[PDB]
Design an enzyme around this catalytic site. Structure first.
Site, PDB file in Angstrom:
ATOM      1  N   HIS A 143     103.324 -35.233 -70.169  1.00 44.85           N
ATOM      2  CA  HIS A 143     104.392 -34.377 -70.669  1.00 44.85           C
ATOM      3  C   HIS A 143     105.668 -35.166 -70.960  1.00 44.85           C
ATOM      4  CE1 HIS A 143     106.798 -33.947 -66.943  1.00 44.85           C
ATOM      5  NE2 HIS A 143     105.619 -33.770 -66.268  1.00 44.85           N
TER       6      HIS A 143
ATOM      7  N   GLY B 168     113.015 -35.169 -63.068  1.00 39.76           N
ATOM      8  CA  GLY B 168     112.905 -36.607 -63.246  1.00 39.76           C
ATOM      9  C   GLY B 168     111.939 -37.271 -62.258  1.00 39.76           C
TER      10      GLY B 168
ATOM     11  N   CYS C  66     108.779 -36.629 -61.855  1.00 36.04           N
ATOM     12  CA  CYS C  66     107.406 -36.701 -62.330  1.00 36.04           C
ATOM     13  C   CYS C  66     106.975 -38.150 -62.540  1.00 36.04           C
ATOM     14  CB  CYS C  66     107.190 -35.868 -63.584  1.00 36.04           C
ATOM     15  SG  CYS C  66     107.235 -34.092 -63.235  1.00 36.04           S
TER      16      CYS C  66
HETATM   17  C1  LIG Z   1     108.850 -33.623 -63.895  1.00 37.53           C
HETATM   18  O1  LIG Z   1     109.864 -34.538 -63.492  1.00 37.53           O
HETATM   19  C2  LIG Z   1     109.169 -32.202 -63.435  1.00 37.53           C
HETATM   20  C3  LIG Z   1     109.238 -32.082 -61.901  1.00 37.53           C
HETATM   21  C4  LIG Z   1     109.668 -30.649 -61.458  1.00 37.53           C
HETATM   22  C5  LIG Z   1     111.088 -30.450 -61.832  1.00 37.53           C
HETATM   23  C6  LIG Z   1     111.716 -29.668 -60.666  1.00 37.53           C
HETATM   24  N1  LIG Z   1     110.802 -29.878 -59.470  1.00 37.53           N
HETATM   25  C7  LIG Z   1     109.553 -30.486 -59.965  1.00 37.53           C
HETATM   26  O2  LIG Z   1     108.637 -30.773 -59.298  1.00 37.53           O
HETATM   27  N2  LIG Z   1     108.106 -31.374 -63.953  1.00 37.53           N
HETATM   28  C8  LIG Z   1     108.387 -30.317 -64.895  1.00 37.53           C
HETATM   29  O3  LIG Z   1     109.491 -30.103 -65.237  1.00 37.53           O
HETATM   30  C9  LIG Z   1     107.240 -29.475 -65.431  1.00 37.53           C
HETATM   31  C10 LIG Z   1     106.924 -29.904 -66.860  1.00 37.53           C
HETATM   32  C11 LIG Z   1     105.802 -29.031 -67.407  1.00 37.53           C
HETATM   33  C12 LIG Z   1     105.509 -29.354 -68.869  1.00 37.53           C
HETATM   34  C13 LIG Z   1     104.538 -29.220 -66.585  1.00 37.53           C
HETATM   35  N3  LIG Z   1     107.643 -28.090 -65.415  1.00 37.53           N
HETATM   36  C14 LIG Z   1     107.900 -27.455 -64.146  1.00 37.53           C
HETATM   37  O4  LIG Z   1     107.595 -27.993 -63.142  1.00 37.53           O
HETATM   38  O5  LIG Z   1     108.508 -26.199 -64.135  1.00 37.53           O
HETATM   39  C15 LIG Z   1     108.919 -25.758 -62.883  1.00 37.53           C
HETATM   40  C16 LIG Z   1     110.380 -26.113 -62.642  1.00 37.53           C
HETATM   41  C17 LIG Z   1     111.011 -25.661 -61.501  1.00 37.53           C
HETATM   42  C18 LIG Z   1     112.336 -25.970 -61.273  1.00 37.53           C
HETATM   43  C19 LIG Z   1     113.040 -26.735 -62.181  1.00 37.53           C
HETATM   44  C20 LIG Z   1     112.409 -27.193 -63.322  1.00 37.53           C
HETATM   45  C21 LIG Z   1     111.082 -26.880 -63.553  1.00 37.53           C
END
Ligand SMILES: *[C@H](O)[C@H](C[C@@H]1CCNC1=O)NC(=O)[C@H](CC(C)C)NC(=O)OCc1ccccc1
Ligand SMILES: *[C@H](O)[C@H](C[C@@H]1CCNC1=O)NC(=O)[C@H](CC(C)C)NC(=O)OCc1ccccc1
Lengths: 305, 305
Positions: free
Chosen positions: B41, B143, B145
């Protein structure tokens, strides 16, 4: 989101751990520049440990009686001295992996990472608070002495702890890297009292802030309190008195959450007086006091090294 | 003595973390030999995340659209491919710090260390269990991920997890290093159910053993039970059924303590039925299930790396 007890990455410290052998006894030392620091009780035998005369014992030792190994790398000792409860062994080779570093004497209530080591080899890493009574609640077996505690700021490793002993209560005691014990402890195998250990109030409040930031808001009430009012309740539950300096330190967290510190104190007072009712906060059924305000902000802004 | 949630030393993994940028988005990658692994992603924009067509998005990208940095060291991408939910970027330079390593798909109930990273820089390290429902309870911000989970055996790093997402419940989901998600998760920004999460019975028993070894013996009773009898109570409290294989795995701990596993099950049953009475076990007022039997033995024999 999420909140976990999180140690510093240990790699900079891993590169400084060595084995120190003096006759029978092996423990860990810390190799920085051309000096190896280790607990002075490396020179003791089984009989000596009740009340070692360290000055007399060290006199029987020469440079060649200290065997220092960094992995397979044998180091050669070219001088030795005792500073308080630590030995400094001067070696022929400067550690090429020496990080930028400082020696710091940490304050009670502050936290640090422990790299537990045996035979100069890292076993694991965990966070610890220096308790108000100058003990830590660690995990150390025979051979763990000379394991160190540290903090990292940007690129600089601040070493604050070296492990020496376990107390009758199962808690742990040690020195700074100048060999001065935290608390009233001495390095002999006698029963030693740590005395009453109080809860680090400012840290509990920090963690309540962490909890709010992470969705747990059930403990919040419609009440407020005063510093004096709260501190009467603090003293009742063996909590440290809260001061304006503490309030000031919580200012960032209070502003971020829009919850006033004295309002959080009122929350904390209800928790203390009425328990938790079998509920939990950030995965815990007890009030947690080993996160500093700094710890909470670091784990919410994603500070790196 | 003492018992703490203890991560592996992270230094071997620290040396493999890199920054991966694709247009606007930056996250972490893992640099092993001449390949960088990261979450696919990285190629998505804000609009794409509801239901990205990854195959279509990746087609718009070339080698030179991926910027990879290891510290200041810029790496040059000479090939890219997508394997499940991970991108593999072939780079011109083999990582000189590549540890001996394996990729493993971990079993539910097993534990591992997470090195939380931002912008390719290590922030901190903590232990996690793969829950029965294939989630972990981590601490990850925007960030994070591409942060990885691992175990170390002697000198070999077994990578088992790469972080991708947070679920509505605040728990975390990710893949193995072949890009296959643990559990039913998909990498899109939709509401996704993890389903019921059960307690890892064998781990709770391991930790009760740890507790006994460390002086806490108050929870022991004069009762015993049977596997069937216990498992009826397990099911009642959403605990995993206990099997003879589990009993066998606890054999070392049972022998070391001289407490039979079914006797510990009877202890566990009383704790489940009658709560703790505001008492605590190894510093906890809840039953802890994120220590494996192996975890307990490692922290009692002082295994090093
Ligand atoms: C990648 O760095 C990020 C890690 C999330 C961000 C907040 N806590 C985490 O573990 N992953 C994502 O943003 C992910 C991307 C999708 C295309 C899979 N989306 C996600 O995890 O949505 C849930 C979320 C919760 C709280 C804040 C932001 C996103
Ligand atoms: C040094 O490796 C060792 C660490 C102890 C061993 C068990 N848990 C620890 O933290 N320190 C000592 O053995 C220390 C040496 C004296 C000369 C200071 N003595 C000590 O800590 O006695 C307490 C003890 C408790 C349980 C087992 C062994 C010793």
């Amino acid at each position: 989101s999420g909140f976990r007890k999180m140690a510093f990455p240990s790699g900079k410290v891993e590169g400084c751990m060595v084995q120190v052998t003096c006759g029978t006894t092996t423990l860990n030392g810390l190799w920085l520049d051309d000096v190896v620091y280790c607990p002075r009780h490396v020179i003791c035998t089984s009989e000596d440990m009740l009340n070692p005369n360290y000055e007399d014992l060290l006199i029987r030792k020469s440079n060649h009686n200290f065997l220092v190994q960094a992995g397979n790398v044998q180091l050669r000792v070219i001088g030795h001295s005792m500073q308080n409860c630590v030995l400094k062994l001067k070696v022929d080779t400067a550690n090429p992996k020496t990080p930028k570093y400082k020696f710091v004497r940490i304050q009670p209530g502050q936290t640090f990472s422990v790299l537990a080591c045996y035979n100069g080899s890292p076993s694991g890493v965990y966070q610890c608070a220096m308790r108000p009574n100058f003990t830590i609640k660690g995990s150390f077996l025979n051979g763990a002495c000379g394991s160190v505690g540290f903090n990292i700021d940007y690129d600089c490793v601040s070493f604050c702890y070296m492990h020496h002993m376990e107390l009758p209560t199962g808690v742990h005691a040690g020195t700074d890297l100048e060999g001065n014990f935290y608390g009233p402890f001495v390095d002999r195998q006698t029963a030693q009292a740590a005395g009453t250990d109080t809860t680090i109030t400012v840290n509990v409040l920090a963690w309540l802030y962490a909890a709010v930031i992470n969705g747990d808001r059930w403990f919040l009430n419609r009440f407020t309190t005063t510093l004096n009012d709260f501190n009467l309740v603090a003293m009742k539950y063996n909590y440290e008195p809260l001061t304006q300096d503490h309030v000031d330190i919580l200012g960032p967290l209070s502003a971020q959450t829009g919850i006033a510190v004295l309002d959080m104190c009122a929350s904390l007072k209800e928790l203390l007086q009425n328990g938790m009712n079998g509920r939990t906060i950030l995965g815990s059924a007890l009030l947690e006091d080993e996160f500093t305000p700094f710890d909470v902000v670091r784990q919410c802004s994603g500070v790196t090294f």
